[PDB]
Amino acid sequence: EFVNKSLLFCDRNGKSFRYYLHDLQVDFLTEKNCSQLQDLHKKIITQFQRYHQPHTLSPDQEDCMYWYNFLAYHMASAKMHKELCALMFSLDWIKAKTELVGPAHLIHEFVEYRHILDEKDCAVSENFQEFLSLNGHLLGRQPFPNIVQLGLCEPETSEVYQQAKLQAKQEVDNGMLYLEWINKKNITNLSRLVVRPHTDAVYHACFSEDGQRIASCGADKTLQVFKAETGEKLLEIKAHEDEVLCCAFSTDDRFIATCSVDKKVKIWNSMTGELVHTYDEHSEQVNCCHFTNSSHHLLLATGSSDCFLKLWDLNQKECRNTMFGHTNSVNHCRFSPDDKLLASCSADGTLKLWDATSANERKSINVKQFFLNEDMEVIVKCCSWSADGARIMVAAKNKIFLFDIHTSGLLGEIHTGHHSTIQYCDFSPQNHLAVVALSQYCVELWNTDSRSKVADCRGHLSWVHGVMFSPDGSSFLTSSDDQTIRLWETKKVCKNSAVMLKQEVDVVFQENEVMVLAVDHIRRLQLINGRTGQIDYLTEAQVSCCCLSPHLQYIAFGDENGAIEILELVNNRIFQSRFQHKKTVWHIQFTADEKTLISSSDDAEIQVWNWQLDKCIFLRGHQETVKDFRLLKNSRLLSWSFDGTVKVWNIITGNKEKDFVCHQGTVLSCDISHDATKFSSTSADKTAKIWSFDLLLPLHELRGHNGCVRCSAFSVDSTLLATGDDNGEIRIWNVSNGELLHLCAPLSEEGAATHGGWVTDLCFSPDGKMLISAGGYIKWWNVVTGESSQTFYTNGTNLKKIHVSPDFKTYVTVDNLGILYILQTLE
Amino acid sequence: GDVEKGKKIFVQKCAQCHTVEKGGKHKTGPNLHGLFGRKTGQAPGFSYTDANKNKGITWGEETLMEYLENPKKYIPGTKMIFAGIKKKGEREDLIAYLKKATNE
Ligand code: HEC
Structure with missing residues (x-):
């Protein structure tokens, strides 16, 4: 009847009809009835309790999805925090939701509804806020872990750890076999955000100019547009039939063109997802896609193995400019801070700066600065423009170079650690800080005109494919082969405890009790006494x-x-x-x-x-x-x-x-x-x-x-x-x-696995019936039709020389990150 | 597989990081000359990761069939960065040209 009077609209699909309003009507009712909101929300909630149960839902029902999504909301508008705290803080609720939904939505709900929560509540809510953000890559993607055990890895102050420990202690004489971490209190630093919307590796990831939405590209051959804050799924757009080489935002961010292996550049709309314009010229792959930072005009820098520099015009159907030179492939082609210029950077040793409007040659620079001590060859990875809009920050071979466009020579030089070759480089407009991807998943933060170590980034699953800055001056983003995009804070990572361990950890045996002997990164070694914070540093x-x-x-x-x-x-x-x-x-x-x-x-x-x-x-x-x-x-x-x-x-x-x-x-x-x-x-x-x-x-x-x-x-x-x-x-x-x-x-049989596929040493149980194995994580097997436990997990990938106590209770191990891991078995 | 398509996949995805020719210098990727019959990461002059040196298999058409498929999978922890050759024909071809040049 409401459909007849045209107050409400009805969509017909499946057996169940689907009703919804039109916006104007919604706002209208919002204004007409105000004071009665509370009544209504508390009404539907009361009803909901009187029928169903909060932790009891059949995913086979027709109403489930709606409840899971908006129940929190309906509680919130009711301004009832009691039943709210009752629902949300519950762990099983989290489990079910995450399994069905995934973390992002829930995170968003925390961030939003945190207001009505009390002062003490804020702490708990927060603990979750970082909890889920850090666990983002693991959760919701099955094979699936235990909530409790993951909660055991949390700081004691965090409510998560206290609840997880509580329930853990509650289950006794249970084949659960929970573990306890004394060491994680001083390690595993917090992170701003961790988000994986990917089954495949990430080729490039960057924040929008307005700092709102994220469009990521990778081996999944699918452009992923999602929210930058809580990480909700927005739009998933197929870019090509082949792997996308590079992608970037425009001036207004409303247009993103993709380049791939199929040698076809396709412009995709962000808010639509339909083809706008397509350009096929190059007979070779295009490694350079870069848009304008201004609304003055719209251009595209492209280059390939054909030794031609082609500048496309988004307004026309053809290419605006074509430039000779660069006998080798151009790795990085980027616009200047002004659209009047174009920067071409290649690994052949030719760094060129061309006029966009004049189309002629402005400057050409060949760098002989790096000494080989058999012609001289200096490769160039990337080119980053300075905040001043004049100087050019680059990284060549084993060192960092700062070039001046005026003098055309070498203005400044920044040293890089040891003999290691620089994989990637980036520069921050604020604080003049710069990040460098060097070797073995190490992102090092250095300062200009300093030559002193500022910060170091650890905790990655793999060697960083690449990292960028968020130009709010506040923070930066990291992207690796771990298929996950992360948000990290600049000032927070700056503090380092220097717990780094390279290839080895050494176990010590005092009677039954176990002691820790670590090989120090800096000089020689660090002696860690068991069950105490006593540390004796030995330097040689x-x-x-x-x-x-x-x-x-x-x-x-x-x-x-x-x-x-x-x-x-x-x-x-x-x-x-x-x-x-x-x-x-x-x-x-x-x-x-x-x-x-x-x-x-x-x-x-x-x-x-x-x-x-x-x-x-x-x-x-x-x-x-x-x-x-x-x-x-x-x-x-x-x-x-x-x-x-x-x-x-x-x-x-x-x-x-x-x-x-x-x-x-x-x-x-x-x-x-x-x-x-x-x-x-x-x-x-x-x-x-x-x-x-x-x-x-x-x-x-x-x-x-x-x-x-x-x-x-x-x-x-x-x-x-x-x-x-x-x-x-x-x-x-x-x-x-x-x-x-x-x-x-x-x-x-669920399909390919992301992290795993590594094993070194196997261990035995004191009973002999149970078995201990490493499938990339801690996994316990059993004889006679089925295994012991899939419980908990091992962070990272690589493992070296697994050792255990002779009592087969307390455990000592380490990941590829070089972080000390201590397990203690207690009933 | 095909030799010259192997030389194409070589000049594209290989030759920039590698030398399969006799007496080739070491580079970002190692000298691949005499690959077949030589164990993983046994070539002097280039510093291998322990991941490759402890692999210790004997490179061949099948070992490269599995490796070039997903180079991170076959030798986990290798400092080789590649997303894998999914096509088989490409593998057979490239490996074939390797069997040509590295023998020469
Ligand atoms: C971007 C980097 C990169 C690319 C692309 C790359 N390689 Fe590698 N490759 C390496 C590095 C670095 C190593 C040395 C691994 C180590 O030392 O642990 C290596 C190792 C190898 C080995 C093992 C040598 C041995 O003695 O065990 C072979 C064979 C090889 N590469 C051939 C290839 C082939 C074939 C391709 C493409 C079809 C290719 N490379 C593309 C970087 C690369």
Whole structure:
């Protein structure tokens, strides 16, 4: 009837009709009835409770979606914070919503409704505000984790941690097996925002001129337009059939053109999503797409392998300008702060500045400044304009260069860390700060006319593809191969605790209790005492690797200066070293006693040397190269190489008992049953073969996975085989007669995975029934039809030398970020 | 695969970072000369990541079939930055031209 009177409109799709108003009518009713709002909202809420339950909803119903979205609102307008706090602060509500919806909407709801909340409430709400923003990449995307365990990683002050800990403690004698973090209180710094609307990597990401909406492009071949604040999904527009090389906003941001592998530049409307104009000229790919920063005119800088610089005009159907030169490909082509000029930057060593209106040549600069000490070649990655609109900030080879357009020469020079090559560079108009992507996901913040370290950015999943500034002067954005766009604060990241750890962490054993020994980034090492904030900083010359001795009292570490340095924990002034095996030393191990140093390198010889003795005993294997070794329960030395030659040596005298070659190529370590020295195996990166020492060749062969084998595991009292692979898959195989019986699939049929596919060392349970494995995160398996737990997670990707306590309770590990991770098992 | 299309994919996506020719210098990407038969990251003069050196496979048409498919997948942690060659024909072709030049 209301449709008949034309007060209301009705859309017909599916079985259920769909009703909605028209705007004017809405505002009208808004004005006509005001005082009665409260009545209405509290009415519908009361009704809702009287029928359904807040945590009880059937996703199969027809009304679910609406409730999930706007229920918070209807509570808010009711000005009732009690039932509000009751609903929102609840964890399961969050779980369900996130699973179905995703975080962004919810975040937005917090940010909006925070007002009605009380002063104390603000703290909690806030805790969530950062919580979800940080967890943004993990949540809502299944395979799905536990809410509680993620809540356990939160600061104690945060209500999230307190609730998660509460419920955790509530579930007892439950196969949940919760964990506790003492270390995360001083680490894992907060972030402004973390948002992934991507199944694929990000090629470029930048903020709009007005700082409102974000349009991102990547390997997904889909332009993603979403809100910059709470990260809600706005529009998803298909740019091309091929991967988009580069994309950028216009002056009014209302028009964004895309360039891709299909060699066709297509202008796309942001608020529409329909084709406006299309331009096909270039016979090569276009790596340069840049728009005007002014409303004066509209131009587009394009370049390709055809050695032509073409300047397009958005007003016409053709190209405005064409310029000769640049015999090589132009990596970065960018407009000046004025549209009257054009900047062309390539890696061939030619940096040119052309007149846009005059179309002629203004300036041409070839940089010989970088010294090679075989013609001189200086590559140029990127070109960033200074805030003054005159100087040009660039980064070449191992150094940063500041050019003056007036003098055309080298005006200034900024040093970059060590010999590392600069991958990317950017400059901030405010504070004259500049960020540089150098090596291994490291974004370093430096200041001009300073040459002193300002800030360092860590916590990334991968080496930063690229980073930009938000020109409010307040903050900046980061984009990596982790497929996630992040918002970071300039002044907040500036503070660094210098907890960085490079390749290694070292566990210490005091009786049952475990202690932490870290290798310091700056000089030597940092000693961290267990269950306390006691830290003893030890400073010496740089070290390549470190190794702890049995019975303790000593330490043995290799350096970058060569050979091996042995030092006593009692007195640091006393040290012993000898020069042998010029090649890089990898593995260093003492014998069962504190004497008879056994060391190896990359070479045909392994050294056995006695100290306080100075006995030099060389053991020749007569091969191409030797990888590493290990000590068994006996005096025998089990060693492996790249040639697939497994040898058994002895102390003080070179001896070969047997020779085991499983396959061709590099063999990874060795795998023993730990029940005895009889059964022994190793990973040949092809199949899994085991020998009982009943022959010179492996007795049993397992072909189950022939593609790649990362590792294998024999559990005690069982002997059942657990195969780790390069794909990061852990397969369970029943072993009795040395043949394959059972079957399990670790991989998911849900499709490709983003982060994972890495495993190094596997651990065992004290019961023997449970299993501990790493699929890129912490994942516990189980024998006989199903596993233990998928619980929690491991931040980052790469892992190195997983270690555990002998009681199999407290755990010690580290990610690629070099952050200390300590686990404690308590009921 | 095809040799000359392999030289095309070489001059495009390879030759800028690599040398497959005999006695080629090391670059951002390593000298690839004598690739087949040589283990991952064994070439002197270029500093490899441990991710590549611990890979230790023997480069071949199939190893590159899997690697060039998704170079971050096959050797995780490599400082090689590439989004992967999804097309098989491109792989076979490029690898073929590698089998030509690196042998020469
Ligand atoms: C933008 C960077 C980049 C691109 C593009 C690139 N490479 Fe690589 N590549 C590298 C780097 C850096 C390494 C060394 C990896 C290491 O040291 O860990 C490498 C390693 C390799 C290796 C392994 C060499 C060995 O001895 O194990 C091969 C083969 C190779 N590249 C060939 C290719 C091919 C084929 C392509 C494209 C079809 C390509 N590269 C494109 C950077 C690149």
